[PDB]
Design a protein around this ligand. Structure first.
Ligand SMILES: CC(=O)N[C@@H]1[C@@H](O[C@@H]2OC(C(=O)O)=C[C@H](O)[C@H]2O)[C@@H](O)[C@@H](CO)O[C@H]1O
Ligand SMILES: [Ca+2]
Length: 474
């Protein structure tokens, strides 16, 4: 039994090594994880920053912000992994050989690998979020499916004012989102208005979304919709249970969220809310613009081995376990005999996952056992297709066939000084954006009055230099 410290959080939860997935991994690898993040910590960014001041680094450092993680490597906090992989990680060695695009995500500008990313199965499923609306509420109110942002506005107003759930109460929450930080709230609100809360590419150039007039318009509109009760008054505080709560209580009318899990509610709530039909629609058009910037990335976050780890060989073997057939299946599907059984050598989920008696989504059930826990593993789309509804599967194709999805800007990588400065600027600007966007949407500040000063503040923090760094790396 090898006791191994780790910093690991995901979706606001510190990794619990007693979860079934990690107990099995412990048996198979003899690695016993001990988290340095405690169970009452839910802010991964603040926890990571605090962790950096605590002295000795944990053996394994997992983090969702890969640019920060790579900077830690460049500074010597994380060790290079490439020799460790070549000598002791045959599964990872093979994975990088077979997948050059994925290998590119793991290699820093200086040629070292400081982290193993958590890869999506991008070349099998590359869409992410889509727009959903309560078709049964449309039918009840005699309304057509809205196809433009103005029509959405009018439709949401009808949801708010005309009691579509039929209970005589003004309790409807027309548009809602699902998030565990301010960035994710903004992400699922501003795409409506063809804005972006992050960096994006435009004709060969890299631009900062929150500095654009499209973002100003998005926030100004959202402020109006907020005041009129068309978007959830609790958007910034409701947290990751928002969708579960608002749909299961027949309050929510529309959202922007991941296609498979959001599609699971029709079956999930069919008995509880007769006629419930939360239906995928193409992104609403804004003056003819039919595009969404919601796309799956090749990876999200990653983990590395710190300079303070006593036994890195043992740890790279732990990293490698997740790329074995059995280890990858474990990460993706949970435990054989519990979450799935093998049928002709292929995992098929059980009723526990597919027909959960407490209305948990299939993905929610899988996360509860430690499956899909973001570390540095490789997702398998067969897991997603294994619980996705027929409507979800048709939905992927709907979005792809209609060419509405714009690829995400890959995370750019820089040389050491530029990387340190970019992350510093990017982080400082993020704080300003998230402060002002809340103030403006909630009505405590006036965006028309304050926008120019906000832009000057971003510039003061280094927006132009960040723009230059981004475009050199592009
Ligand atoms: C890597 C990871 O855990 N990503 C999180 C998202 O998970 C995706 O969610 C869905 C879905 O249909 O809901 C399908 C994908 O298979 C799965 O990877 C998602 O939970 C998101 C919510 O904000 O958070 C990501 O970190
Ligand atoms: Ca009502």
């Amino acid at each position: 039994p090898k006791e191994t410290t780790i910093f690991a959080m995901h979706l606001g939860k510190a990794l619990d090594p007693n979860l079934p997935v990690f107990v099995k991994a412990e048996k198979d690898t003899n690695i016993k994880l001990v988290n340095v993040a405690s169970q009452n910590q839910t802010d991964q960014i603040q926890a990571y920053n605090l962790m950096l001041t605590e002295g000795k680094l944990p053996d394994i450092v997992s983090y969702e912000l890969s640019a920060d993680l790579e900077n830690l490597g460049i500074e010597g906090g994380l060790i290079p992994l490439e020799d460790l992989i070549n000598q002791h990680a045959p599964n990872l060695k093979k994975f990088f050989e077979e997948n050059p695009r994925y290998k590119k995500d793991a290699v820093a500008v200086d040629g070292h690998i400081y982290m193993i990313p958590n890869y999506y199965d991008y070349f099998n499923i590359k869409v992410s979020q889509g727009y959903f609306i309560r078709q049964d509420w449309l039918e009840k109110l005699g309304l057509k499916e809205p196809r433009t942002v103005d029509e959405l506005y009018t439709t949401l107003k009808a949801f708010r004012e005309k009691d579509p759930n039929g209970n005589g109460k003004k309790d409807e929450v027309p548009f809602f989102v699902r998030a565990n930080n301010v960035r994710k709230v903004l992400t699922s609100l501003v795409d409506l208005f063809k804005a972006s809360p992050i960096w994006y590419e435009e004709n060969g150039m890299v631009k900062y979304g929150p500095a654009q007039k499209e973002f100003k318009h998005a926030i100004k509109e959202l402020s109006k919709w907020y005041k009129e009760g068309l978007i959830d008054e609790e958007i910034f505080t409701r947290g990751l249970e928002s969708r579960d709560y608002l749909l299961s209580n027949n309050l929510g009318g529309a959202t922007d969220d991941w296609i498979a899990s959001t599609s699971s509610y029709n079956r999930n709530l069919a008995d509880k809310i007769p006629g419930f039909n939360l239906k995928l629609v193409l992104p609403y058009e804004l003056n003819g613009n039919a595009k969404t910037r919601h796309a799956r990335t090749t990876y999200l976050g990653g983990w590395g081995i710190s300079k303070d780890a006593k036994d890195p060989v043992s740890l790279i073997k732990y990293f490698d376990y997740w790329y074995s057939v059995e280890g990858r299946r474990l990460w993706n599907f949970g435990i054989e005999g519990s979450e799935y059984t093998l049928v002709d050598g292929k995992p098929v989920f059980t009723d526990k996952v597919l027909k959960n008696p407490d209305g948990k989504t299939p993905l929610a059930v899988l996360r509860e056992v430690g499956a899909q826990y973001r570390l540095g593993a490789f997702q398998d789309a067969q897991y997603e297709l294994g619980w996705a509804s027929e409507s979800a599967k048709a939905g992927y194709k709907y979005y792809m066939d209609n060419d509405v999805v714009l690829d995400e800007l890959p995370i750019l990588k820089y040389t050491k000084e530029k990387s340190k400065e970019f992350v510093s600027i990017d982080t400082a600007m993020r704080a300003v954006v998230e402060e002002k966007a809340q103030q403006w949407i909630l009505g405590s500040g006036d965006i028309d009055k304050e926008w120019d000063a906000y832009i000057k503040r971003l510039e003061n923090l280094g927006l132009s230099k960040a723009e230059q760094i981004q475009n050199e790396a592009f």
